[PDB]
Design a protein around this ligand. Sequence first.
Ligand SMILES: *[C@@H]1O[C@H](CO)[C@@H](O)[C@H](O)[C@H]1NC(C)=O
Ligand SMILES: [Zn+2]
Ligand SMILES: [Zn+2]
Length: 440
Amino acid sequence: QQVGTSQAEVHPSMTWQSCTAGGSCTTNNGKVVIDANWRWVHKVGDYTNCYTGNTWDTTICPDDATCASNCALEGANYESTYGVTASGNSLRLNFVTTSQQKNIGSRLYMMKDDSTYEMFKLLNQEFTFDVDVSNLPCGLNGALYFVAMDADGGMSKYPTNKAGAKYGTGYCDSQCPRDLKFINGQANVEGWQPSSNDANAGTGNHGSCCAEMDIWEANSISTAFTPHPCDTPGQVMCTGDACGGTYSSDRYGGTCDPDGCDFNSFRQGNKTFYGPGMTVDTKSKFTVVTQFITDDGTSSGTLKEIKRFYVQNGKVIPNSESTWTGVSGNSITTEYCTAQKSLFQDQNVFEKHGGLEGMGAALAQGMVLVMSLWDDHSANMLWLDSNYPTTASSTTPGVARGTCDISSGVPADVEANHPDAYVVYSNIKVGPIGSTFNSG
Ligand SMILES: *[C@@H]1O[C@H](CO)[C@@H](O)[C@H](O)[C@H]1NC(C)=O
Ligand SMILES: [Zn+2]
Ligand SMILES: [Zn+2]
């Protein structure tokens, strides 16, 4: 896609810190950028939309290549259009924002400069941040995660992408999403079908696959952390139902793990660890620490464990024990993942696509930091905070993931009832293991 000039693009500033062993930290002058799919996209030299609602203008966009030549991405009004504000080290995302139109959610990337994403290298490090999830109900997800995107959003690779990381291009994840309008400097107009329950979304013939480390998928009820390996760690375009993932008919038939190896304390058998009034109390802000432990204690070792700590009211809180017979420990390891998928009777494509070693291979490439807020038009967020699948018995291991009602989270309802919902991410720190909090 091309660059529109009607609205200048100015990235809100957000600082984060780099820490050294011993706990000293240096402040980095980061900036954030909204993902290209949220943007106005119009004919070059005109105001005519290339895409409106959930359908393309097939005169401007008769095929994927012509569409990319003829269609320009615009700059964003972060606060007024998108409900996005930042100050100091804090980023706030609001759910619904009404201007001339009604915007729902957002997805932001951390930038190193105005044309380059910050490439985090997490092996043998910890990532730590503070969050306020107190205004997130059932059905919403404030996600903070990492994906193996290209640092320039694909500009050097794809000359027909003139916009790049400045306009939030190049997204990919472990669902191999087919709902993206531009992938690899081509539109996705070919094969495009509108969503049956999302007035703003649809899916095309192309998807964008890469490995994904879900540090944080959460609301006030439940949270989960989840590595998703792929056969290739970096961005790849896929075609058709062969993509696999949530957007295709056979979830498990592609090159990425769409389920991941998850640790949700509630799902792992402790109903009183995370939530309102719980050990980790969602009514207030708390710190989330995530460690990526390697086999040899260096950044070139193989990923072997993912550990989680929380800090709240100055108390360091280790992750809760998994309580199911045969599925113990409080971290993600290969042995956990094998044992968990077996007990829960889930298909283990985690191992098939490389397990933790494959996730570590993605981490070694460098990864982009994503902060988002969304509702779930495929599964109503029930997989995070309710029984899933909703037909199953809540006494079966793996079924119950939080206390939300099985009828919660319908997007029409979520959009109507919680337009005011918001999340606040702040105080990001990255450094050697133990360096970012009162360890260990
Ligand atoms: C839940 O986790 C907390 C903190 O680790 C612990 O004190 C409590 O006993 C746990 N509950 C169960 C059922 O294991
Ligand atoms: Zn016009
Ligand atoms: Zn929605």
